[PDB]
Amino acid sequence: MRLREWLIAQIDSAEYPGLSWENAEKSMFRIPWKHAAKQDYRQNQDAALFKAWAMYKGKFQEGRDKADPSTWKTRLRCALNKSTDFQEVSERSQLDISEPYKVYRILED
DNA sequence: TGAAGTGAAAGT
DNA sequence: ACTTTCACTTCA
């Protein structure tokens, strides 16, 4: 699975709290984006999606690899921003709240 | 304060 | 088809 299909599956699964569809037609989604220095940040919940992508691509096995959620986060961020399959919609990305999240559009084709 | 984050560019 | 690295900035 490429990143677009993989993330579609992760959003649909509802297994990551706050990683969910922004609108009814499922063209837009929210991705939780909590700053890791915050009190209430928990890696097991807040870094789990980034972790999953790293493991899905073989870029982290618990054992060979230092577990660095900051490098998991940047990897997904750079992947999202570089691919023509996605577009960040900063207008509805709400980063000032308690469960802050970014919004992305998924481009079809 | 030092950790965590970033876009841009260089990278495989 | 994404990934890694840089200087520099932003965060709590």
Side-chain angles (χ1 to χ4, degrees):
Chain A
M1 287 198 296
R2 279 225 227 151
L3 170 60
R4 170 173 75 193
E5 285 45 71
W6 184 88
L7 251 184
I8 299 331
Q10 314 310 320
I11 296 130
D12 277 325
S13 83
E15 302 249 40
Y16 303 87
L19 177 86
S20 44
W21 287 115
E22 249 287 292
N23 59 9
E25 329 98 88
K26 295 184 182 178
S27 68
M28 277 197 116
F29 63 98
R30 305 154 110 160
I31 179 167
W33 213 261
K34 191 199 236 53
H35 194 287
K38 261 286 262 163
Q39 298 181 342
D40 66 304
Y41 173 89
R42 299 289 128 139
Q43 312 147 276
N44 286 339
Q45 173 194 154
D46 283 295
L49 184 61
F50 312 138
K51 176 134 177 235
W53 174 247
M55 300 166 70
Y56 187 78
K57 300 296 292 294
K59 289 294 215 231
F60 168 83
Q61 36 188 117
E62 323 203 62
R64 164 196 349 123
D65 297 327
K66 176 151 226 83
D68 196 325
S70 158
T71 75
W72 305 339
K73 194 172 182 175
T74 61
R75 195 192 278 118
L76 191 48
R77 173 174 48 76
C78 295
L80 288 169
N81 290 341
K82 187 47 213 60
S83 70
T84 54
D85 292 351
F86 299 88
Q87 172 71 35
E88 209 205 317
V89 177
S90 170
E91 188 176 29
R92 41 216 300 179
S93 158
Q94 286 237 282
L95 294 214
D96 255 33
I97 40 185
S98 32
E99 318 310 309
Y101 62 84
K102 274 187 155 180
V103 170
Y104 275 87
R105 170 129 35 60
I106 296 166
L107 295 178
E108 307 271 3
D109 276 51

